Amino acid sequence: KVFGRCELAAAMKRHGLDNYRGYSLGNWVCAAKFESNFNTQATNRNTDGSTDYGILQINSRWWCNDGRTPGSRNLCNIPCSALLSSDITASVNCAKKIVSDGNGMNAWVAWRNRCKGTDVQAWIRGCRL
């Protein structure tokens, strides 16, 4: 499923991401836009052999199991395919574990390079939340 900007903002808010660990909703919507262009089915292979899955491009090296990433961890205890669902619950729950890991949202390269330090509030403007 390809989410609309405000539709995703509402979905994330409902799942408790607004201000989660101090990150305003705009940060999460901005991260989703540049990681997957709001597409839940996005996948991207990395040079190390791991793959990123879903709306927030969660990596199979540490967070989910895809059966093809040797010596990898499954910290979110879920098959990576679950992260491609139209229902973002799995992605949100796993993202909460990731952002609490100690490096905050810096774990998402796109957020660090394209959202961090910008006016992220603009990503939820005009939305009925």
Choosing from 34, 43, 75, 104, the residue that interacts with Cl ion (CB under 5 A) is: 104
Q: Residue type for 49, please?
A: G
Is residue 112 close enough to count as binding Cl ion by CB under 5 A? no
* d(C-alpha 40, C-alpha 7), whole Å: 13
> Which segments within the chain are labelled E, that is strand?
43-45, 51-53, 58-59
Catalytic status, residue 7: no
Q: Residue type for 120, please?
A: V
Is residue 72 close enough to count as binding Na ion by CB under 5 A? yes
Choosing from 56, 65, 92, 124, the residue that interacts with Na ion (CB under 5 A) is: 65
Catalytic status, residue 35: yes
The active-site residue, picked from 7, 35, 87, 119, is 35
Q: Is 66 marked as binding a ligand?
A: no
For helices 25-36 and 5-14, the axis angle rounded to 10 degrees is 130
Is residue 79 close enough to count as binding Cl ion by CB under 5 A? no
Annotated binding residues for substrate: 101
